[PDB]
C-alpha cells in the first residue's frame, strides 16, 4: 500500500505546484 501513498503524495505536490504557479493623445480626448 506504499504505492498508493506515494501516488497521493505526488498528486498533492503537483496540486501545490499548480496552485503556486498605446493609444494616441487625441484618441484619449476623443474617447472622453
Amino acid at each position: 500500500x506504499x504505492x498508493x501513498x506515494x501516488x497521493x503524495x505526488x498528486x498533492x505536490x503537483x496540486x501545490x505546484x499548480x496552485x503556486x504557479x498605446l493609444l494616441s493623445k487625441q484618441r484619449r480626448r476623443a474617447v472622453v
Binding site: 498605446l22 493609444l23 484618441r27 484619449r28 476623443a30 474617447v31 472622453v32
Partner: protein, 139 residues
Amino acid sequence: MADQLTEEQIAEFKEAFSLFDKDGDGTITTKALGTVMRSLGQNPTEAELQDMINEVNGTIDFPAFLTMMARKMKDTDSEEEIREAFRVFDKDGNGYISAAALRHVMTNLGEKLTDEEVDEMIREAGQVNYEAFVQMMTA
C-alpha cells in the same frame, strides 16, 4: 476653433457687442471690454482682461472679442467635460464603477475600440474612484 460654441452664445455675444458698439464699426475701447463682460454676469478682475489685449492697438474688433470669449469658455468646459463623460460608467453617480461593467460598455462606444485596447487601458491603471480615471485618461 470657434465651433465649440453653439449658435446661441454667438447670437448673445453679438447682442452684447452691438449694444455697446461705438458707431457700428465693430469697435470698443479698453474700458468697454470690461463693461461688456460685467453686463452678462461674468465678473473677472483686471488681470483677466490685462492679458487678452496683450494676446490680441486699442481697437478690439468683433472677431477678436469672439475668440477671447471662446478661450474663456473652453477652459472651464474642458476641465468639466470629463465628469459628465464619467456618469454613464457608474449607475449611482458618486464615482464608483464596477470592473465587470466596463468591458462591454467601453468596447461599444463608436471609436472602433477592439477588445485589445481596453485590455491595455485598464491594466495600465473591485471599483476605482473618479479622480483616478482622469489621472489615467489624460496621463
